[PDB]
């Protein structure tokens, strides 16, 4: 039970993570970028989430 | 302690490089900030690179 | 303002490439040729 | 050449310079589409204790 809690915690910790994007909130860089930008940042995110 | 509407600066053909970098100059309409600064000096041409 | 995905008073109002466009944009000085002149509008 | 730079704070306090945009009226325990000085999302808004 502990094992099963440690790996959801960290998969949810990996949600605050950067990966090097400039934040770790997707919202973030749909709020500051428009697309032609904003998805150089968010394959960032698709590359370090999955 | 203002409202900025970007859109009158952007709009404006005097500026021969209006270059956003951390955010796109649409978005400025759209975006709220906690402080904002404006540097301003005078430079040769060939430096504004 | 004449690439893809831009923003401006052509790239807005009066001719806009797709944020993906595949082609050429090929552009010369023809104040040789045009100058004069005020038959070409824009918004 | 006469250099503007509009250096942003983007860091999180209290909205202090914002976009040239009404608000609207908040509405509670109901899903809505918000925006709150440019924090956007969707959701459900209630009272917090």
Same mark, same amino acid.
Request: aromatic share 10%.
């Given at each position: 039970?502990?094992?099963?809690?440690?790996?959801?915690?960290?998969?949810?910790?990996?949600?605050?993570?950067?990966?090097?994007?400039?934040?770790?909130?997707?919202?973030?860089?749909?709020?500051?970028?428009?697309?032609?930008?904003?998805?150089?940042?968010?394959?960032?995110?698709?590359?370090?989430?999955? | 302690?203002?409202?900025?509407?970007?859109?009158?600066?952007?709009?404006?053909?005097?500026?021969?490089?209006?270059?956003?970098?951390?955010?796109?100059?649409?978005?400025?309409?759209?975006?709220?900030?906690?402080?904002?600064?404006?540097?301003?000096?005078?430079?040769?041409?060939?430096?504004?690179? | 303002?004449?690439?893809?995905?831009? @923003? *401006?008073?052509?790239?807005?109002? +009066?001719?806009?490439?797709? &944020?993906?466009? @595949? *082609?050429?944009?090929?552009?010369? +000085?023809?104040?040789?040729? &045009?100058?004069?002149?005020?038959?070409?509008?824009?918004? | 050449?006469?250099?503007?730079?509009?250096?942003?704070?983007?860091?999180?306090?209290?909205?202090?310079?914002?976009?040239?945009?009404?608000?609207?009226?908040?509405?509670?325990?109901?899903?809505?589409?918000?925006?709150?000085?440019?924090?956007?999302?969707?959701?459900?808004?209630?009272?917090?204790?």
């Amino acid at each position: 039970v502990n094992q099963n809690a440690q790996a959801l915690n960290t998969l949810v910790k990996q949600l605050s993570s950067n990966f090097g994007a400039i934040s770790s909130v997707l919202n973030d860089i749909l709020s500051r970028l428009d697309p032609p930008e904003a998805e150089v940042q968010i394959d960032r995110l698709i590359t370090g989430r999955l | 302690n203002c409202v900025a509407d970007y859109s009158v600066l952007y709009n404006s053909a005097s500026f021969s490089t209006f270059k956003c970098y951390g955010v796109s100059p649409t978005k400025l309409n759209d975006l709220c900030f906690t402080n904002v600064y404006a540097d301003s000096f005078v430079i040769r041409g060939d430096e504004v690179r | 303002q004449i690439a893809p995905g831009q @923003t *401006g008073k052509i790239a807005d109002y +009066n001719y806009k490439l797709p &944020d993906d466009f @595949t *082609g050429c944009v090929i552009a010369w +000085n023809s104040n040789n040729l &045009d100058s004069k002149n005020y038959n070409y509008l824009y918004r | 050449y006469r250099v503007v730079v509009l250096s942003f704070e983007l860091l999180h306090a209290p909205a202090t310079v914002c976009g040239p945009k009404k608000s609207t009226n908040l509405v509670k325990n109901k899903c809505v589409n918000f925006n709150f000085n440019g924090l956007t999302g969707t959701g459900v808004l209630t009272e917090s204790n």
